[PDB]
Symmetry: C5
Subunit: 258 residues, 5 copies
């Protein structure tokens, strides 16, 4: 692709607006947005998480107005986590901080991640423990070895399916993803406080150092997200991941290529 000039005129821009729901595990029909309570294996080698205990990456492929050579170029993004105030419910069967106290709020390990691309997000597999048995119905690094704990280049995949790719197994592949922009923060530790900002006044520019944004192959925009906000502690002490949805607004323009 030689990238040429931007088209102008009223017809030359379009806008995508949507939300991606979190996929935390959904252990029963009342617990959308939550994982199954977390249990711990008896040995390192016997690590064997249930499917409904593993948060996954979310993805949406959004069709754009048909063009044909012109391509849609993603230029700007507004994004935010939806429902941050729900985490103020400290009265719904949680564990009291101390005698007569309110319930403990959602807190601890979080991963907040989003990406915008002109093709599927490309993933690299990395395992905390290569002998972890990942459950049926997930897509996980295959033929794991001890090198998979640091870097095994065999573990390549595309984020091309929902409720499938566990967060703990996969990261954006920094050796690829030239046609995607991705942003993520892992904040680890059992007592980490959620710090969630909302505003409709902040815009991220998606242009690279040459002034070119993601170019949407086949007229599809790919949006991906994870928002594991922390863990909810129930009265018994058992803990569940809690996630929230993410809003995306992307502005695109037509770009000629050869």
């Amino acid at each position: 692709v030689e990238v040429l000039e931007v088209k102008t005129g009223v017809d030359s821009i379009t806008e995508v607006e949507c939300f991606l729901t979190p996929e935390m595990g959904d252990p029963d029909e009342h617990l959308r947005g939550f994982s199954k309570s977390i249990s711990i294996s008896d040995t390192f080698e016997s690590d064997s998480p249930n499917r409904d205990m593993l948060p996954c990456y979310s993805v949406a492929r959004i069709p754009l107005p048909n063009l044909n050579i012109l391509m849609w170029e993603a230029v700007t993004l507004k994004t935010e986590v939806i429902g941050v105030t729900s985490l103020m419910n400290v009265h719904s069967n949680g564990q009291a901080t101390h005698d007569n106290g309110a319930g403990k709020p959602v807190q601890g390990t979080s991963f907040h991640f989003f990406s915008v691309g002109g093709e599927a997000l490309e993933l690299q597999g990395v395992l905390f423990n290569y002998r972890t048995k990942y459950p049926d119905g997930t897509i996980f690094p295959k033929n794991a070895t001890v090198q998979s704990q640091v870097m095994n280049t065999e573990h390549k995949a595309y984020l091309d399916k929902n409720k499938a790719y566990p967060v703990e197994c996969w990261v954006p592949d920094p050796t690829r993803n030239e046609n995607t922009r991705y942003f993520g923060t892992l904040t680890g530790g059992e007592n980490v406080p959620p710090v969630l900002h909302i505003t409709n006044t902040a815009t991220t520019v998606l242009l690279d150092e040459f002034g070119v944004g993601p170019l949407c192959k086949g007229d599809n925009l790919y949006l991906s997200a994870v928002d594991v906000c922390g863990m909810f502690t129930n009265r018994s002490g058992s803990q569940q991941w809690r996630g929230l949805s993410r809003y995306f607004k992307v502005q695109l323009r037509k770009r000629r290529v050869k």
Copy 2:
């Protein structure tokens, strides 16, 4: 609205200055600014908070000089009023340890403010969809399990005080094009309040095209939540504590077609 030129001249600007009081629940005649002590339900399905235990969004609709021209909100100065009150650690609080001072207000906070030319638009999200919200509050109706992540049926306008519980509602990011909003949720039982005050900081309300909120019907809409944390009494029971918020907004007349 096609937005055209700004009017100039001595008559062409105006200023709104006010404060919004917090609405934390007010459980009795001595406890303005506090919620009821928080109690925990023994199951998810039996979650059933009392009205006076739920902080709500504050809102004021401010009439502007009668005026096609519209008032355009350009700048905002804002701050939380009474930050130093949180230094009262001698008033029936739980000692930090034997012979120690009382615990200050701390833990989960939500600080939020918006300025718009129409009512703030809200989207409902529920921690627990089976929570029974109390009479006298306006809350997401026909909740389902999807309401725990995103149910698009839950749309509302922040059009009334002491009504919209903070925990149920957020600004709808899919709308609000004629409002500017800003908020931070800081969660965790031991989070320290960090409250800055100064009269030297201004927030510009103009969008990327140089246009601020345009006030429909000559009304400016101001909204706020300032849940500062929880106060722990000697018994250990805990109450939300909130504070008032100052707003100063400058506006100018804008022609539209």
Copy 3:
């Protein structure tokens, strides 16, 4: 006051340099810089703090070279807390963190505040608890009602006296103070660590958005400050506010007005 031009020439500038001592309560002749140990009332209605338990705002009214219409205009400020390293004394009958350990350092709730104006700082009263009986010798919000716990516009005052205005009752009135610049941070929580920066290389500009600094009425510059650094914990577990002095260096120039 229409503000007109700045005077130039060697005679046209002046400098104020000084320090404000903290007023933490001073419970006896050995405890300048400390409050009385803090006690807790059994009920809200019986809250009744002793004077020497209440830190107060510090203020100085500094006379300037006499002018008369010209007025001194405050243009820049350098400021810092004096004696930050004294908080490293962890050997002076404090409470040991653990068996054989050093003493707990000053920590917990802090308020750091300073203002420069051409008249007395204007205050608004806000009470944690409206039924608090404030002690003789202090100046506190009068005719308190339950609305005083959020905003009662009857509680207006000027910071016009030392050892008088308790920190916990009063804040700068944001509805006034047009001829003052003020800056403050409240950091609450029993374990918050003091973070105190010192340098002689930082300058704050005091000019407003029109290029005009505070104009000194009657040729007086008003400086105000609070630096409650935290609490010192004694071996017994009793706690006392600890404060430190604040340095001010202000540069001024002569300004004509009509």
Copy 4:
């Protein structure tokens, strides 16, 4: 070297892309990326760590297209690879409390990376000069009590993998003119890892005169440490956990005399 002009033309730029794996100790065939469990000596003077308990600096020498012209390193993109693996809180860790999830990796971290046109230069500093460092490591020799603060005899090059323990060595600030290095030590047993990833951030490697590292013998030297914290097992024993680091470096041809 007098540095002269940059060569232009299609042939005049090149790109290096790779990853450096961490060297945390690798106590057995299943534990790449981990150290041996940490033990505490009975006395200060008997401090005597095993080799597989000591994380080491990673280094790669990368050959460049054979070229007086030299390759000049101009920009760097870098990130830690596999940050989300630290969400595994179910793999025989120590529960935070009764029925709770396992404690995540946390505590003391060192995140460090450098790009140079020759080996990173090191200075030795010891916590405890009487520490007996183990065979198979390269450590400061002829240690004295001054080695606890600054002993200028302890100079070395990062010229070998699994050799130079992190706790003994730092970049020598008195040298390294032809290298750019960046590091952060965050100490304390409960420190939370804060790991950012993005493909949109670039670090410029040019010094104040507009000159990047010049690659002697057509080799680029990359170095890294990413000790993320400690994993706590169910027994309470603790092991350092590290992750790999991505590097992408852009270079251009520079004439020198």
Copy 5:
């Protein structure tokens, strides 16, 4: 009167060095550490031993002999040996059963200054009845006002292992010919956060474009880097400090 800067190959020079910490050095094996910290039985009987008190470090660096004066223009600085704080195996106190040792942490003071004369100090005492030990230089004739501000307590940082950190700060009412920077982070569990890089420069010029001017052709460097406290197995605690690197660039300036 400050006049023009000299140019030419001969007109610039560079100082590079390190200042070692002075934490107390309680014996011949414990350079970089203080004595274990003890707590007095009463407030009035506070009485620290010398080897328990960290002190300011200072170096006076001679410059090429030169009216012209050397003007300090830029500074690169960093703490040397940050990684040594990863030693969690050296008879420390275990965080929990079978755990590693607790790392250095808690109260820290990180401070550095560059000047054309000795750093000027002001004395402030936590407790005016503290008896400071022989061999230190401390505020004399202390009164209760010394707990907040007693202007009698002026000194120059003109000697090593002498001026205790807890007694003295840079005097903000003087030091016009010095640039100083410091951060106190207090609290028993504060985590050390130490950044290293060779890519960061601090400009030393004031608002008029003039850096410190070196009187008698001497450059004065000062530092404190109390990183926290090391906890031994017994629970006893000792300050731990590290050295600090300085690289200062200077140019010749004419004055009248």
